[PDB]
Design a protein around this nucleic acid. Sequence first.
DNA 1: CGCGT
DNA 2: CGCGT
Lengths: 827, 827
Amino acid sequence: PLVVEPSYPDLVINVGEVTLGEENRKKLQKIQRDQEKERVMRAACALLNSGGGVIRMAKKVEHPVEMGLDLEQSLRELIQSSDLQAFFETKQQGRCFYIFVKSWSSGPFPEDRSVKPRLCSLSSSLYRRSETSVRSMDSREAFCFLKTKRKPDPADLIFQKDYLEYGEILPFPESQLVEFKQFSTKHFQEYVKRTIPEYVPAFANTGGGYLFIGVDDKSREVLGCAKENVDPDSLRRKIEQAIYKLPCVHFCQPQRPITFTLKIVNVLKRGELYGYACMIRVNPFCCAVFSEAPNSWIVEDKYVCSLTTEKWVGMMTDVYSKKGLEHKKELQQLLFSVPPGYLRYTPESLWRDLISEHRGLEELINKQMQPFFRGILIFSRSWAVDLNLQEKPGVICDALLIAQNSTPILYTILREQDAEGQDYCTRTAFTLKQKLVNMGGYTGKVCVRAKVLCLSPVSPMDYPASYSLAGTQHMEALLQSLVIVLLGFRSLLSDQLGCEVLNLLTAQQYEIFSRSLRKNRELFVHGLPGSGKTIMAMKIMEKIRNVFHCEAHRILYVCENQPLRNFISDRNICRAETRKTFLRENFEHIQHIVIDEAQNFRTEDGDWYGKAKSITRRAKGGPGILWIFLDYFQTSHLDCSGLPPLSDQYPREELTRIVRNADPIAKYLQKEMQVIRSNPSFNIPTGCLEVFPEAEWSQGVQGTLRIKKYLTVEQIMTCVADTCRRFFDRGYSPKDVAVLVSTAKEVEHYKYELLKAMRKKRVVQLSDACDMLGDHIVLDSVRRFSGLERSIVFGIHPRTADPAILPNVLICLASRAKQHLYIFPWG
Amino acid sequence: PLVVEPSYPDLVINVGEVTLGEENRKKLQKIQRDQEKERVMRAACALLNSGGGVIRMAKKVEHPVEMGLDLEQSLRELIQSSDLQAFFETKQQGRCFYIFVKSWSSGPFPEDRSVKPRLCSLSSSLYRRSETSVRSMDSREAFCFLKTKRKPDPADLIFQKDYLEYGEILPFPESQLVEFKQFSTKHFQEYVKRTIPEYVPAFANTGGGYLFIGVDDKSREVLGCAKENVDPDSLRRKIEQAIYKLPCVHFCQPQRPITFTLKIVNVLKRGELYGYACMIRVNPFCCAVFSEAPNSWIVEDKYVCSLTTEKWVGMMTDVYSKKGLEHKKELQQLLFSVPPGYLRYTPESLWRDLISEHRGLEELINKQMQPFFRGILIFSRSWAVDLNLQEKPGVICDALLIAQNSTPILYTILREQDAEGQDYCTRTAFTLKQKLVNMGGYTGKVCVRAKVLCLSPVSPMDYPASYSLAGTQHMEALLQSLVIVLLGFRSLLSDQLGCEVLNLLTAQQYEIFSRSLRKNRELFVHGLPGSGKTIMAMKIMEKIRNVFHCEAHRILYVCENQPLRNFISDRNICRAETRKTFLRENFEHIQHIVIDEAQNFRTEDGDWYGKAKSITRRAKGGPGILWIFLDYFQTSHLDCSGLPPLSDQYPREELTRIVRNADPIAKYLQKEMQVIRSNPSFNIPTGCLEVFPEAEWSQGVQGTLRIKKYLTVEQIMTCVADTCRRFFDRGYSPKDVAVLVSTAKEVEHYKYELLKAMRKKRVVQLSDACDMLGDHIVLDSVRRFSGLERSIVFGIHPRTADPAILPNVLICLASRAKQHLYIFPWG
DNA sequence: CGCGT
DNA sequence: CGCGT
Ligand SMILES: [Mg+2]
Ligand SMILES: [Mg+2]
Ligand SMILES: [Zn+2]
Ligand SMILES: [Zn+2]
């Protein structure tokens, strides 16, 4: 049995000793030649079906030799093409011969999923009748055959006869439905046992047919067998068992077995009994019949194991990120852009942190990177824990080098030398290489060299020149597969990719929404929580500038809260004012007005809606743009908002797709949205809450939502400090964290508590929501943080004076967290 | 040479006499066996590449025989599968043997266009190096190879040597880049000439390589040739010409020829000259190199002709209706629905006309249709003229029978027997069978039996049972291909299909537009001419009924003209009133108001727009639906329309895609729309005319637009009568014709003129636009016909009091004609 | 009631 | 001016 040898960052199969060179292979016996060829092809098929690898054979000579014609031909038949160079390449050193096998079909959703089969096989064991011959279906033919099976005669006149005359010539020839077999008494029991698996499956798979045993092929005459040797009762039993032993696979109900009719008749010579003849009428089968189990191999664990009949068929016919696959090119250019001329280090924030803690790490890496002047070096504190492997204490970092004219290399830096250091890097490099194929769907020839560096002051296999990254096109296609691989796990770069997917989803939803600028002047946009409402408002206000050619100070943005006002002002899109400022100052020079979070406005200061109409309707271009963005699910107050009644809020646009939160967060919003629908607040108009999200919609971005309850303030605030430290250690920056409390008067109570326990984590800095550019944790109230959002949000004791609003607070809070959310409610 | 014999409604190739049966083929000489096999395969390839047919061979025996193993194997290699039954079927009668060949790839846009090749070939003549052997690319391999080509070493150390020692053993073996050939002096000039076409193309197509001539394969030793026989100067010339004569096909610029380096060296034995050796370094080629012309055949005219190198490659890599292809299933169920239980006759209107003119035609057809009780019988006065063939005088009709458990049959009925009658039906049946494959893209096995019937009181080839229509699934797929075939020609059924495509395009544009009912209450829909504006209004008014659950009398439709009012009233969608009626009567009970052709309204009677707002804004559901459909391109008057100014006409929807007129009509509307944009009328607001149609849009529906000028009234009115008679003879009904004059006062002048000239055409009946259900030609004014449309429209002397409106009249007139338009302007 | 005052 | 009157 072939066993994969584990000292390598790849699948290496040692097939032992194999004779090579056609001259040397010819001199061998047929059995030995066939055994060596079959072992090599078992290895090659196993590597083709398992992501690729290396086949290791030890040759019996020193001088260079060719592989041999039979080995080449079997490989060609295996990949069903003469393009042998694409999948196989050979190198030899001394007494060792290497065959480097590429993967046959790579990825969970290949671009050729419905065209080419996923498995290579030595033989599919599916035969069919092809006029007067029985032929086996190759992998492509068997693939199409199973695909069609999956979708939802003068010869009988002889069959009805109860006896046959010796030497009777049958009129019909051999054809698609008739086969004549000659029956010899010396091996008659053995002959009929071997005949059945070749012809009965061949007939059943294509239209049925008749099998005449005891009829001469050449002259079509009835001969039969010796009567003294054949037992008519025993002969039927052997035939019946040989048919019922054939493996068959059903795609339908019912699952009746193979149907046939067996008739045994006397052969008459001069009116006297001479012997017996066999006729088999095989009705067509509803599904596929195999003569035996398919001969296909796969590498599972460290062994090479064969695929069973059911697993072969199922795999032949039939975390993975759907969004990462379609946006793989857009994501790669955002993060893993390859710079022409210099070697880029990413992530830069984590690289700076590493060289600060460890002395001489900057010189160690820089000296090692001297050979290569183009590519990207991707850092991580532990690439093993990023790929869901176990973390090794004593490792400083891991760096994955993807450079031009170089194979991918995984660098592991150790503080002190260790014997386990090389095993750890080999296991991680092997895991990364398999993910790039089985998960990221890389169709090229990929290898990952495992290298270990020690900060304190088995041979590497030499791959062909085709495994090196030739240029920009190879590095880009490799990195786009790394994008898909990263998105399947929880890590820092996975979370950076996840955020950029959410910005890609919103930019798609904006192009649909942005078409309403030509069609409307006054509009009431009724967005759902996490629908990207505020992001569209900023994008629209840029569009209004571009379409109507008005200057920035001509567009007015009005919001209820101050932190959101400052955030908009810093973008320099337009003039941004609060509602109170809007009702006080004079705005004669304004042409267009955009209002956001209008459901949180109040009438206590003045009639803002009438004022908004007056400024816009007296503009130069007739009725100017007066768009009101609002979300009744996020109603934080019980007073009158000042909006016109629901029947007057026309025309309308509705943002229903949640494109701004990760999957666990988005699923949480919908759950809380249903609660308010059952018990809406009295102030909200009746028809507001019947707006529903998209029928089926998922962002394909994974996140975290955890709720911790009955903890006291010290226990809550410790978990906040501990969790931030773990995030900060992995490389996250403080500007991705926010701690939201219920009320602004409660900020000062908790700000002292946070600094008390979070000072132990070597940072004593906090910021308010009015400052969003500072690289500090933002602590403020939930209501004051509306319009803004952070990757990581901590919600501490959500509370309100009226439980009718309490569902609205959690939705307002939960929607603020793009990916990670931690809530600590009252207990 | 094989010639297609033309007495058949199919491609029949007579390959002469062929020996059949493996026992009989073995006894033959190799040359004779190869010649017979190659002739049969030329025929089979020609039929596979040319839509299918029958291969006719005369066998040398009477009793049934099999085809033979070599013939079967060559057919399998031809179709690259053991599924031999799908494409080939065999029947034999007496001394004649039939092979029925299905088409390889059928259709101009097959469902497998980028997957499977379009050509079957005996050999592609494309070789490549596969490790230590040269292999030919089959059709699939060559297809993929050309697809990739289309997209935008220790061996050198011996090559640099200027001389070689006799018996020197080369270290490297034969491999992907090195080939060792032994050179014999007896045929050295002949050997090198034959060697080049096999190996030089093999190297050039895959990565280049080295060709050593004069080196022993087995022992790798340098031997060379005899020095007295080889001429070094002559030897280079023969090698160079043998390389430059290789055909090559380029997909790129530039087109530099094949690049190679030839070195001839002295072979030294014991320090003395022994002979010469040849080394060739072949650089990889930018494109494909053929060893010789590809061996693929096609049937052109009546001959079987071979494909050249350029035509083979071009066809290998690379009127047809796009709309008919995508809507082929929807169109088929509309017209050619297969009825279960009875044999349907279509078109029913033409069938009734035929049995009236000709006595006993009903009994002739009914007696003939007794055998078959399911299917459809498709009539036409001449199927030949429908397929752009020549019409035969003396034929009464043609009927195409598509029935269950029957091959398609084309019936031709003759008034009197004729010798040309069978030739005419055979030519038409052959033409129809080829169109269903080359144009309609039928992938099944299809035959069309040509039958002739005589009203006044060569053998049919027997096809296999697989050519009969098994059931509903086969008949539907055959008819859907007939739908695509019909749409490529001008005929009655082609025009019925064309109209139903226009109704399919409008129903697509409506689903996009119908989403604006939830988003708007008041809306101003600015439609383009031929955009389907009135059709959406009727569809919306049904939607308003369904969505708001209001009754029909609660919805009010207001239009300027009377005939459109009656047409809407007869639909029972709602209450429909004219503008004058709207301003007079009281409409207190109305909830929603829909206004169409608002640009043609006038203020002389009263302020309709203010009245429309008052009724809708005081409705029960707040501001009820008040949608105004309008089209400023169709402004027929110079007064004030009463609409609010262009800046107040918000929100807006715009119907820009022309989905209501055929291609020649639609192209005419855009040409006239551009004229008004250059010189708009003074009454139209400035920003109205800058609305543009879809950037690129074509209906895929063909029609007719003809302009006849300087004709006198009698000359004009004769062409109207003559053209109607020709249309009516083909089976068109009078309710598809309209004659539109400039002014309603001018109707009475022309109505007498038409009845004077059209009475010769056996119809003396006309109708006004107020009656649209009567089966009579509608004659009325252009303005009075607004909102309605007819398949065939005659426009006689378009005139107006102001030339600023004159472009608007032609657009208003032209948009009335769905498919056929005839205009007779002033001269 | 909460936040901008 | 044209059509519904
Ligand atoms: Mg046999
Ligand atoms: Mg050789
Ligand atoms: Zn079954
Ligand atoms: Zn080229």
